[PDB]
Amino acid sequence: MKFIAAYLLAYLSGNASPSAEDLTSILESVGCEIDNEKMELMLSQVKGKDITELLAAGR
Amino acid sequence: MKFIAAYLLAYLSGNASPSAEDLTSILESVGCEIDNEKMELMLSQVKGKDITELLAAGR
Amino acid sequence: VACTLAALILHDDGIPITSEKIATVVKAAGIKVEAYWPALFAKLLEKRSVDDLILSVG
Amino acid sequence: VACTLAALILHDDGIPITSEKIATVVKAAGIKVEAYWPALFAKLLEKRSVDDLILSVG
Amino acid sequence: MAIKRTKAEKKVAYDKKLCQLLDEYTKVLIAVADNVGSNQLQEIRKGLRGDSIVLMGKNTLIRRCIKVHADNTGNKEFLELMPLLVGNVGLIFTKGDLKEVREEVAKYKVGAPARVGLVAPVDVVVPPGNTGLDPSQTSFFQVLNIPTKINKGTVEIITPVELIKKGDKVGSSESALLAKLGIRPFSYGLVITNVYDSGSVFSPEVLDLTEDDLMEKFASGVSMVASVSLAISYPTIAAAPHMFLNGYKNVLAVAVETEYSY
Numbered sequence: 318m319k320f321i322a323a324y325l326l327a328y329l330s331g332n333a334s335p336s337a338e339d340l341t342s343i344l345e346s347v348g349c350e351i352d353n354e355k356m357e358l359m360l361s362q363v364k365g366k367d368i369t370e371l372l373a374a375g376r
Numbered sequence: 377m378k379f380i381a382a383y384l385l386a387y388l389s390g391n392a393s394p395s396a397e398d399l400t401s402i403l404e405s406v407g408c409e410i411d412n413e414k415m416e417l418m419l420s421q422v423k424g425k426d427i428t429e430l431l432a433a434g435r
Numbered sequence: 436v437a438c439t440l441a442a443l444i445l446h447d448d449g450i451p452i453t454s455e456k457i458a459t460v461v462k463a464a465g466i467k468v469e470a471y472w473p474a475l476f477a478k479l480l481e482k483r484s485v486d487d488l489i490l491s492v493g
Numbered sequence: 494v495a496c497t498l499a500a501l502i503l504h505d506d507g508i509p510i511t512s513e514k515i516a517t518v519v520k521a522a523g524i525k526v527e528a529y530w531p532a533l534f535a536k537l538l539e540k541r542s543v544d545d546l547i548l549s550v551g
Numbered sequence: 552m553a554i555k556r557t558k559a560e561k562k563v564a565y566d567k568k569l570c571q572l573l574d575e576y577t578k579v580l581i582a583v584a585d586n587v588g589s590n591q592l593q594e595i596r597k598g599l600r601g602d603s604i605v606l607m608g609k610n611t612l613i614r615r616c617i618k619v620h621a622d623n624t625g626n627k628e629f630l631e632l633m634p635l636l637v638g639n640v641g642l643i644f645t646k647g648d649l650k651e652v653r654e655e656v657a658k659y660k661v662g663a664p665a666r667v668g669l670v671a672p673v674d675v676v677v678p679p680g681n682t683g684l685d686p687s688q689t690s691f692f693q694v695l696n697i698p699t700k701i702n703k704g705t706v707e708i709i710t711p712v713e714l715i716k717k718g719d720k721v722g723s724s725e726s727a728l729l730a731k732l733g734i735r736p737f738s739y740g741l742v743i744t745n746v747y748d749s750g751s752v753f754s755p756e757v758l759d760l761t762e763d764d765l766m767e768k769f770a771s772g773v774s775m776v777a778s779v780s781l782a783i784s785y786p787t788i789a790a791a792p793h794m795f796l797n798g799y800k801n802v803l804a805v806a807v808e809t810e811y812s813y
Contacts, residue, residue, distance in 0.1 A: 318447050318768070318772070319444060319447050319448050321765070321768060321769060321772040322440050322441075322443045322444030322447060322772065322776075323440075323444055325440045325769070325772065325773065325776065326437055326440035326441055326444060326460070326464055327464055329436060329437040329440060330437055330464050330465060330466045332464065332465055339463075339464070339465075342463045343444075343460060343463045343464055344448075345463070346459045346460050346462065346463030347444060347445065347448045347450060347456075347459070347460055348448070348450065348459075349448050353751055354751070354753070354757060357648075357649070357650065358650070358757070358760060358761065359765070361648065361649075361650030361651065361760055362760065362761070362762045362765050364651075368769075371766060371769060371770065372769075372770075372773050374770070375770060375773060375774055375777060376767065376770035376771065376774065377505050377784055377797070377798070378502050378505045378506050379784065380501075380784055380794065380795070380797060380798035381498045381499070381501040381502035381505060381798045381801075382498070382502050382518075383798075384498045384795075384798040384799060384802070385495050385498030385499055385502065385518070385522055386522055388494060388495040388498060389495055389522055389523060389524045391522065391523060398521075398522065398523075401521045401522075402502070402518055402521045402522055403502075403506075404521065405517045405518045405520065405521030405522075406502055406503060406506040406508060406514075406517070406518055407506065407508055407517075408506040408507075408508075411475065411478055412471075413471045413472070413474045413475035413478060414475045414478060414479060414784075416471060416475075417471070417472070417475050417785065417786055418784070418786075420786075421786040421791050427795065430792055430795050430796065431795070431796065431799050433796075434796060434799065434800060434803060435493065435792075435793065435796045435800070436776070436780065436785060436786075436787045436788075436789070436790060438785065438787075439776050439779050439780055439783070439785060439790070440776055442779065443772070443775055443776060443779065475785065476785060479783050479784065479785055480783070483783075485779075488778060488779055488782050488783070489775045489778050489779065490778065491778060491782070492774065492777065492778040492781055492782070492793075493781075494802065494813065497802040497805045497806075498798065498802060500805070501798060501801050501802060501805070533811060534811075537809055537810055537811055541808075546804055546805060546807070546808050546809075547800075547801045547804055547805075548804070549804060549807070550800065550803060550804045550807055
């Protein structure tokens with residue numbers, strides 16, 4: 318999906334995934350209009366999660 | 377793929393896999409135009425790797 | 436990889452995986468453009484079913 | 494094997510796996526031509542789906 | 552309030568205080584205590600009261616229009632979808648994000664025995680097992696539709712079952728018997744009808760915030776990245792060992808159907 322790849326892509330660079338600073342910017346650079354609710358849900362789910370640990374099981 | 381089989385093939389002979397000397401020569405002998413950009417990422421990925429050890433897990 | 440993640444987002448958004456389109460997403464991320472790496476990436480992705488590769492893998 | 498790697502590269506490049514085509518890649522590698530091993534190899538590969546064999550294997 | 556005589560008891564005074572309070576905070580959420588007791592509300596109010604705080608009022612609560620009339624947006628009577636106030640609502644104004652507030656309010660609810668004639672908010676079930684009560688009117692449990700028997704001289708419930716379904720009213724008799732059992736099924740606290748922040752209106756389906764489902768989609772999406780990474784051969788760090796084998800596996804494979812031994 319758009320949201321998953323965009324915050325994953327920011328994660329490789331080491332850049333955080335915030336609302337306006339990187340997640341909307343990456344999706345706007347795609348040329349797509351980002352849905353705020355989908356960004357907000359992804360940021361809220363991300364909080365307090367270790368993205369590196371979840372990748373390490375792969376599923 | 378072209379690149380993987382070509383450096384693997386050179387590895388069986390014991391020949392190194394460099395850019396121009398063997399990797400382009402094997403691909404040019406196939407009759408295909410190589411890439412420099414893949415050939416440099418395959419060569420760059422190869423550096424400091426033990427190809428024999430990676431084969432030994434098979435996956 | 437930033438380049439692999441950029442490709443999957445470009446296909447999900449419905450946009451072609453070419454040098455311009457990868458470069459715009461890569462710039463929005465803030466990662467510097469390197470000509471060799473996106474060029475290999477477009478070349479590796481040429482002649483591919485993105486859909487059929489995605490699903491397999493041990 | 495140099496002969497097995499030569500076959501997979503020839504199929505990836507899109508060229509047929511025959512004695513001439515294996516011989517040219519084998520010569521570019523610098524490995525001496527031996528008529529029987531490439532002749533056995535073309536014969537073993539005859540009547541095959543290269544695609545269907547590649548994927549399995551324990 | 553303590554001033555029981557006629558003097559205000561306000562209109563425009565509390566609505567003006569409520570006015571500045573919406574204008575003060577980024578996020579405004581509209582919530583239901585009606586299920587909750589008085590003390591039980593104070594203790595949820597106590598948590599919120601540290602972080603940033605909530606107010607009750609009546610039609611003076613509808614005046615999300617006057618605040619909006621002050622600013623430029625769309626959380627009001629006019630631009631909103633259908634105003635998500637319901638009866639017995641209050642307004643929670645906060646610094647705290649909507650998702651976090653939903654989890655705060657929804658995740659930590661206080662258990663509170665059911666009531667007679669109340670509609671079950673969720674399915675109510677009874678467990679099998681000995682009540683520990685001696686023989687007496689076991690019959691009341693059976694009247695309720697709880698099968699029971701005397702086992703070892705004690706009244707026991709034969710099997711687990713759902714006594715009443717969600718959305719169904721709890722009969723008086725049922726409530727009384729559940730209470731004797733010590734069963735406390737229902738969860739009370741402030742239910743969220745809506746949240747506003749920064750030009751968007753969020754409903755309770757949004758606010759109950761999925762979240763495992765993206766861990767699977769992230770792992771799958773990463774497996775989509777990873778897959779692409781092994782097969783493609785495109786090696787910065789992770790993808791790289793998995794590819795090398797793809798030329799070898801394809802070859803090791805090439806030995807298996809076949810008819811060379813070498």
